[PDB]
């Protein structure tokens, strides 16, 4: 499930290519792309 | 018995209105001649729309345009006008249902229908809603607070509510509901729900929302938005002068946002209610600097910065009361407010 | 940002001495000098590490967008 | 989105499904095992048989809001578990049926099947008037040829019981009316469900068995009490029954009958509407906050309007900004006790007064005909005097 | 505020329709003196989609995240004086989005 | 992204002297009339700066 957070409502959501880019709980038009459990390697320096 | 929340089963009523108007344009046309769907829009274009209020009440004193029209009605003269419009109503009367044939033949005789159209609809959803609308009106007519809002709260969850009685029983139910909510909130939610900053009147057959009690944001004031400001100043008065305060400022800046467009735009209580909130803000500051010269023995307290802040405001208010008069505002009995304001000045001395 | 792990100059682990030190200025109502003396930061490299710290993370943390407000 | 034959197929399908959902709540409610379930299946299997035959482009078969319950009614007749008026009132009162709203589906999609002008025209169009359910049942029987396939339908010594307990339940009028039924009521034989009124004019042959049962019921009461020479039923006794009757709460039943009254129809209960005995008012709003809770899940608002709506409900959220009331046989007991002091022109008037009341009650559960009922009454009146 | 004094200094702008009239044929094709009485500035609001909607206060965080201006609708009460007084016309005109100073008496903050 | 004219999945390449990490992806439909397809996105990169020879202090 892809996720997109409402910049103004904190409500988690899962946008689709078939829906309006808006917070369904707030109505905002700005969305932070949520971080997920994805592996990234790091040199501990 | 009470007024229902819904668009009126649009089925027979819409063709009864065709036959009514079509006859009225036919009979009237031949009155205009003796004097020498679209029909329904033309009937209103022949008598204009309804200003923002209710009944085109306007004085009763200016123009004595004499009407003695000579009664001018010889049973014989009425049946000369009528003998031809009725035969032209039969063309369309045949294509109409048997119920609408006699409904037309009743209203064309001048009989009125004791058959309330909202006393026959038999639609589940609608069915109930009539029971709830009447239930809540019989419960506020005995002040049953704990049961009236249960019925009110269910009435809006069913798909059939246009602000309507929701904004007019939704506020008192919250005044009678000593518990949760200040019609205010609900009132400010309504204001944002129906700003209708768009100037729409006339044109189409307003047959779904015809009460100057929802609509506006054009010119025709909204009355829940005027009630929001009036309830808000009365909500400011209680236990003031008897940083968490702000309310009398919140109300100064929530009209400031307006400053005419539709409300500023249109005059009155808008201006007047604003001045009244402003006049109350001048009294509180005379009290907070009143009793026995301000509080007491003098002020020494750096001259009177507080008197100058108040005289600025008294001079400002008098500007708002004056522009509300000048712009046609009949609302304000100026004589009393000016005497109160001067006798109050005499407290500030 | 956050109390450094070790004193840049010396090498002494310092990240353990923050909350107690703050507690010791609160709880023990001590003075910074005596508090660090009881904490063992007996070198100015280790003294300065904590003395100069500005745990600005508390100011950052109030901007957390992952909770409603 | 669709139309013609294939639209007709899923219109068909959807009809298929809701009836199925109807039947299983059926089982949960009264729990009457495989039996209730399978008989109902094949009943519609039989109904489907006919639809396929006159197919080609036959679109006469979209089922009436009523056809579904007629089906369940007929099948219940296959088994003979209950009654019609009772079933109908119970169903409306508890929304036991998914009958009134057709959004359930499982269609979200069947909904969109751009329910053409078939799928949309279903599950909840309106409430039955007069026969309504009495005429469709006959049509179903005709298509069904139900009587041949069906054993002992419309009978039920249970409707008589339901009726006596219904009110002035007299440990004697059950046998009285059973006896007049015995009498000329189809040569002392349990009334069977009428036939497959094939004809489309749906004449009022008056063969719907129950309709006649209620008629015998009414008749019995006034005859009986209209000739109790021995004076077994005291003058002051008759009005006491009608008295106590004077509507009272209901361990569920009377509350239900109020809910049915609220189809506001011929104004016999309309006024009950306004009167609505205090609490009756209250337990009413209770049943509204529970059973029109799903008045609708959905769409609209376009990622806002919805929010606004939520906020609004937010605001006047409310819903709370002897267990007290009693059961059915409790009320029943207490009014037969309320009459338990048992041991000219006025009584005739009282008798007429009482009969109008029952006319209200029995008529109100059913398609009434503030005349047909009467017509029905008239009919057997005539039937009777051939002694 | 200063801005109303500014509009008090701009005074009038007069134009004559070459009022024909057939002095009435060269002494005024009817004077029309247009001026501006007040000028109003509102705090940033945003209406969704069109305008038939209820507006919301617009916050600077929004302008930065959107990387856009932080505009307030500028309005001014227009005075349309005809024939030196033959006709008075008022108009609240919206003059586009004026960039508002943050933390000003016109910024929500 | 995908442009029907090219019937191709095309990409905007990253142009820098050093690698970074994607810090924020911000979806902007704002000030738009509809634009529901989310055609404007602001992406913030976090580029670490280690103390190094030649850096001014
Ligand atoms: Zn160190």
PDB file of N, CA, C and O in Angstrom, chain D residues 137-160:
ATOM      1  N   UNK D 137     -49.094 -12.097  -4.624  1.00  0.00           N
ATOM      2  CA  UNK D 137     -49.026 -13.467  -4.137  1.00  0.00           C
ATOM      3  C   UNK D 137     -49.821 -14.366  -5.071  1.00  0.00           C
ATOM      4  O   UNK D 137     -49.377 -15.458  -5.424  1.00  0.00           O
ATOM      5  N   UNK D 138     -50.997 -13.900  -5.477  1.00  0.00           N
ATOM      6  CA  UNK D 138     -51.840 -14.671  -6.383  1.00  0.00           C
ATOM      7  C   UNK D 138     -51.138 -14.870  -7.719  1.00  0.00           C
ATOM      8  O   UNK D 138     -51.167 -15.957  -8.293  1.00  0.00           O
ATOM      9  N   UNK D 139     -50.483 -13.817  -8.204  1.00  0.00           N
ATOM     10  CA  UNK D 139     -49.769 -13.889  -9.471  1.00  0.00           C
ATOM     11  C   UNK D 139     -48.641 -14.906  -9.377  1.00  0.00           C
ATOM     12  O   UNK D 139     -48.424 -15.702 -10.296  1.00  0.00           O
ATOM     13  N   UNK D 140     -47.936 -14.890  -8.252  1.00  0.00           N
ATOM     14  CA  UNK D 140     -46.836 -15.816  -8.020  1.00  0.00           C
ATOM     15  C   UNK D 140     -47.360 -17.245  -8.003  1.00  0.00           C
ATOM     16  O   UNK D 140     -46.747 -18.146  -8.570  1.00  0.00           O
ATOM     17  N   UNK D 141     -48.511 -17.447  -7.364  1.00  0.00           N
ATOM     18  CA  UNK D 141     -49.117 -18.768  -7.298  1.00  0.00           C
ATOM     19  C   UNK D 141     -49.484 -19.246  -8.695  1.00  0.00           C
ATOM     20  O   UNK D 141     -49.279 -20.412  -9.033  1.00  0.00           O
ATOM     21  N   UNK D 142     -50.013 -18.339  -9.509  1.00  0.00           N
ATOM     22  CA  UNK D 142     -50.380 -18.670 -10.872  1.00  0.00           C
ATOM     23  C   UNK D 142     -49.151 -19.079 -11.661  1.00  0.00           C
ATOM     24  O   UNK D 142     -49.187 -20.034 -12.434  1.00  0.00           O
ATOM     25  N   UNK D 143     -48.092 -18.276 -11.603  1.00  0.00           N
ATOM     26  CA  UNK D 143     -46.882 -18.643 -12.328  1.00  0.00           C
ATOM     27  C   UNK D 143     -46.334 -19.918 -11.715  1.00  0.00           C
ATOM     28  O   UNK D 143     -45.931 -20.846 -12.411  1.00  0.00           O
ATOM     29  N   UNK D 144     -46.333 -19.937 -10.390  1.00  0.00           N
ATOM     30  CA  UNK D 144     -45.874 -21.076  -9.614  1.00  0.00           C
ATOM     31  C   UNK D 144     -46.753 -22.308  -9.761  1.00  0.00           C
ATOM     32  O   UNK D 144     -46.250 -23.434  -9.730  1.00  0.00           O
ATOM     33  N   UNK D 145     -48.054 -22.119  -9.940  1.00  0.00           N
ATOM     34  CA  UNK D 145     -48.924 -23.289  -9.895  1.00  0.00           C
ATOM     35  C   UNK D 145     -48.610 -23.907  -8.517  1.00  0.00           C
ATOM     36  O   UNK D 145     -48.473 -25.120  -8.366  1.00  0.00           O
ATOM     37  N   UNK D 146     -48.508 -23.018  -7.528  1.00  0.00           N
ATOM     38  CA  UNK D 146     -48.156 -23.284  -6.139  1.00  0.00           C
ATOM     39  C   UNK D 146     -49.044 -24.217  -5.346  1.00  0.00           C
ATOM     40  O   UNK D 146     -48.553 -25.011  -4.549  1.00  0.00           O
ATOM     41  N   UNK D 147     -50.350 -24.121  -5.552  1.00  0.00           N
ATOM     42  CA  UNK D 147     -51.256 -24.966  -4.793  1.00  0.00           C
ATOM     43  C   UNK D 147     -51.040 -26.448  -5.096  1.00  0.00           C
ATOM     44  O   UNK D 147     -51.115 -27.285  -4.200  1.00  0.00           O
ATOM     45  N   UNK D 148     -50.827 -26.783  -6.367  1.00  0.00           N
ATOM     46  CA  UNK D 148     -50.592 -28.181  -6.715  1.00  0.00           C
ATOM     47  C   UNK D 148     -49.283 -28.596  -6.056  1.00  0.00           C
ATOM     48  O   UNK D 148     -49.196 -29.643  -5.417  1.00  0.00           O
ATOM     49  N   UNK D 149     -48.252 -27.780  -6.227  1.00  0.00           N
ATOM     50  CA  UNK D 149     -46.936 -28.092  -5.675  1.00  0.00           C
ATOM     51  C   UNK D 149     -47.092 -27.949  -4.161  1.00  0.00           C
ATOM     52  O   UNK D 149     -46.440 -28.664  -3.405  1.00  0.00           O
ATOM     53  N   UNK D 150     -47.931 -27.037  -3.690  1.00  0.00           N
ATOM     54  CA  UNK D 150     -47.976 -26.808  -2.242  1.00  0.00           C
ATOM     55  C   UNK D 150     -49.038 -27.429  -1.329  1.00  0.00           C
ATOM     56  O   UNK D 150     -50.239 -27.353  -1.594  1.00  0.00           O
ATOM     57  N   UNK D 151     -48.556 -28.042  -0.247  1.00  0.00           N
ATOM     58  CA  UNK D 151     -49.413 -28.576   0.813  1.00  0.00           C
ATOM     59  C   UNK D 151     -49.919 -27.576   1.826  1.00  0.00           C
ATOM     60  O   UNK D 151     -49.181 -26.674   2.215  1.00  0.00           O
ATOM     61  N   UNK D 152     -51.186 -27.706   2.210  1.00  0.00           N
ATOM     62  CA  UNK D 152     -51.851 -26.839   3.187  1.00  0.00           C
ATOM     63  C   UNK D 152     -51.421 -25.386   3.393  1.00  0.00           C
ATOM     64  O   UNK D 152     -51.108 -24.986   4.512  1.00  0.00           O
ATOM     65  N   UNK D 153     -51.409 -24.586   2.323  1.00  0.00           N
ATOM     66  CA  UNK D 153     -51.077 -23.143   2.467  1.00  0.00           C
ATOM     67  C   UNK D 153     -52.214 -22.202   2.833  1.00  0.00           C
ATOM     68  O   UNK D 153     -53.340 -22.496   2.420  1.00  0.00           O
ATOM     69  N   UNK D 154     -51.907 -21.117   3.578  1.00  0.00           N
ATOM     70  CA  UNK D 154     -52.848 -20.219   4.348  1.00  0.00           C
ATOM     71  C   UNK D 154     -53.667 -21.134   5.260  1.00  0.00           C
ATOM     72  O   UNK D 154     -54.597 -21.788   4.792  1.00  0.00           O
ATOM     73  N   UNK D 155     -53.340 -21.290   6.515  1.00  0.00           N
ATOM     74  CA  UNK D 155     -54.177 -22.172   7.305  1.00  0.00           C
ATOM     75  C   UNK D 155     -53.846 -21.631   8.627  1.00  0.00           C
ATOM     76  O   UNK D 155     -54.337 -20.574   9.023  1.00  0.00           O
ATOM     77  N   UNK D 156     -53.001 -22.344   9.337  1.00  0.00           N
ATOM     78  CA  UNK D 156     -52.567 -21.715  10.575  1.00  0.00           C
ATOM     79  C   UNK D 156     -53.650 -21.475  11.619  1.00  0.00           C
ATOM     80  O   UNK D 156     -54.436 -20.533  11.513  1.00  0.00           O
ATOM     81  N   UNK D 157     -53.682 -22.339  12.626  1.00  0.00           N
ATOM     82  CA  UNK D 157     -54.611 -22.177  13.730  1.00  0.00           C
ATOM     83  C   UNK D 157     -53.890 -21.162  14.599  1.00  0.00           C
ATOM     84  O   UNK D 157     -54.406 -20.686  15.610  1.00  0.00           O
ATOM     85  N   UNK D 158     -52.674 -20.850  14.163  1.00  0.00           N
ATOM     86  CA  UNK D 158     -51.793 -19.896  14.813  1.00  0.00           C
ATOM     87  C   UNK D 158     -52.164 -18.448  14.545  1.00  0.00           C
ATOM     88  O   UNK D 158     -51.930 -17.579  15.391  1.00  0.00           O
ATOM     89  N   UNK D 159     -52.718 -18.156  13.362  1.00  0.00           N
ATOM     90  CA  UNK D 159     -53.207 -16.804  13.106  1.00  0.00           C
ATOM     91  C   UNK D 159     -54.397 -16.494  14.000  1.00  0.00           C
ATOM     92  O   UNK D 159     -54.530 -15.363  14.502  1.00  0.00           O
ATOM     93  N   UNK D 160     -55.277 -17.480  14.198  1.00  0.00           N
ATOM     94  CA  UNK D 160     -56.367 -17.307  15.151  1.00  0.00           C
ATOM     95  C   UNK D 160     -55.825 -16.991  16.545  1.00  0.00           C
ATOM     96  O   UNK D 160     -56.268 -16.039  17.197  1.00  0.00           O
TER      97      UNK D 160
END
